[PDB]
């Protein structure tokens, strides 16, 4: 196995690629339909969802755009957003591609109530989506909550121009004392299990000694992150304060002394919490000493593909 081909691993889990179908299908459309669409998803998923509050350090570090904006006159604030979508070259794209998805989230979650008060410039009263973006925002309002939230996280990700790097401080990981332990049917790896217990601890500096040197981390519809020094940057960048919530699993030989372990249950976001359950398998493949040559997390593409 290399890495490339361990993503071959489990071929039967089924993943919800109507996720990257759909950012494809909107990343097409006319930048203004691009901001429209989401701003109607928004106000609707709005209903039932609540969207938890961005982080203060997260907000200070967004201040000085997010003042740039507010300061220009309306038509000038409509096209910093539709830069923003188009990718253009500026240097408020640029500085918005330096931030972690976490900063950008919290950018357009501070936009979103501005133009909801009427502060900065509003999509326009009686807009009309093109016909392109009309379906998209329908095949959106069709998707599960956890494939219409990781839509939108991933659209907001890909907007602006690509280098320095701007993220929230690393918060200390959970005191021993408090941590809880896992429980996964059929899987007691101890690998598997201090993955899912050093995650739910924010413990970034334990977990990456469960890597080989040359191991790989496969978020959602990304490639591998290959390597401890780019693995813990995403994981410190990116992966705080989530709920992993593993259900059962199974355990199998792999070549040459390797195991591969499929596990399936839930996660929760901190944008979230409780009120949106993602359906996700782990895929780990392990050497024989029990240290991560890879694993991928998938979003599943519904609670059928569960174990
Ligand atoms: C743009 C825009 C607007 C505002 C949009 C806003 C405000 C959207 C907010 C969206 C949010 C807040 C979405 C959040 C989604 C979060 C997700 C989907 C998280 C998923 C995490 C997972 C699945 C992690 C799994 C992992 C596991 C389990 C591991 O074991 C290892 C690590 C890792 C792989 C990370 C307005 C309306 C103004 C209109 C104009 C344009
Ligand atoms: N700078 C960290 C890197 C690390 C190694 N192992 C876990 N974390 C320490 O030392
Ligand atoms: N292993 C099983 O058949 C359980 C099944 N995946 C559900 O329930
Ligand atoms: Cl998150």
Do not use: H
């Not at 792999?254 to 839930?266: L, R, S, W, Y």
């Amino acid at each position: 196995f290399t890495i490339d081909s361990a993503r071959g691993i489990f071929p039967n889990t089924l993943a919800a690629d109507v996720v990257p179908a759909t950012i494809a299908r909107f990343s097409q459309l006319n930048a203004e339909d691009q901001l429209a669409l989401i701003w109607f998803a928004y106000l609707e998923m709005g209903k039932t969802l609540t969207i938890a509050a961005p982080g203060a350090a997260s907000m200070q570090l967004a201040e000085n755009a997010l003042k740039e904006i507010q300061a220009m006159g309306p038509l000038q604030q409509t096209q910093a957003m539709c830069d923003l979508a188009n990718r253009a070259d500026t240097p408020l794209c640029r500085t918005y591609a330096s931030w972690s998805p976490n900063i950008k989230l919290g950018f357009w979650y501070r936009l979103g109530e501005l133009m909801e008060q009427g502060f900065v410039a509003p999509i326009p009263a009686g807009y009309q989506l093109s016909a392109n973006a009309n379906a998209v925002l329908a095949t959106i309002q069709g998707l599960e909550s956890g494939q219409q939230i990781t839509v939108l996280r991933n659209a907001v990700v890909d907007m602006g121009f690509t280098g320095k790097r701007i993220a929230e401080p690393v918060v200390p990981p959970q005191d021993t004392a408090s941590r809880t332990k896992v429980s996964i049917e059929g899987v007691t790896n101890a690998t598997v299990l201090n993955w899912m217990d050093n995650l739910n601890a924010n413990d970034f500096d334990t977990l990456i000694e469960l890597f080989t040197s040359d191991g790989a981390l496969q978020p959602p519809f990304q490639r591998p992150i290959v390597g401890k020094e780019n693995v813990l940057r995403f994981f410190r960048e990116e992966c705080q304060n989530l709920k992993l919530i593993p259900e059962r699993g199974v355990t199998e030989p792999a070549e040459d002394g390797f195991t591969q372990i499929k596990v399936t249950g839930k996660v929760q976001t901190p944008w979230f919490g409780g009120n949106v359950g993602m359906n996700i398998a782990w895929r780990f493949l392990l050497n024989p000493e029990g240290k991560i040559f890879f694993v991928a997390i998938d979003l599943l593409a519904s609670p059928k593909e569960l174990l």
